[PDB]
């Protein structure tokens, strides 16, 4: 049956400024089927309190989800998103870049 690969975007709600509160988002989109595992990571460790949006799909019936959590970025801290899906032979880690 149809299997589409998730496109992953790791970003912040607001422009990253050290010491100021913000939201970290991991946006997975264009995947199928809906069974997906998305974890937000701080320095490789799983962030506990992560909320997610509700499951919706696009014109080609591919699902989209947004996972998010509050965080305060710093100069040395590293944030990322681990995504696992049937279409991925290996769970993909997408690092958070302040300018992407």
């Amino acid at each position: 049956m149809i299997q589409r690969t998730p496109k992953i975007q790791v970003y912040s709600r607001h422009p990253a400024e050290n010491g100021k509160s913000n939201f970290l988002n991991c946006y997975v989109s264009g995947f199928h089927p809906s069974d997906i595992e998305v974890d937000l990571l701080k320095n490789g460790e799983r962030i506990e309190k992560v909320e997610h949006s509700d499951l919706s799909f696009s014109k080609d019936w591919s699902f989209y989800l947004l996972y998010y959590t509050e965080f305060t970025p710093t100069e040395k801290d590293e944030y990322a998103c681990r995504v696992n899906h049937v279409t991925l032979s290996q769970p993909k880690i997408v690092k958070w870049d302040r300018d992407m």
Binding site: K7, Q9, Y11, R13, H14, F23, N25, Y27, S29, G30, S53, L66, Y68, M100
Partner: peptide
């Protein structure tokens, strides 16, 4: 170009 993404507050981002 990246897909238009939600910011989480009811607005959107793109670059």
């Amino acid at each position: 170009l990246v897909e238009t993404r939600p910011a989480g507050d009811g607005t959107f981002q793109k670059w």
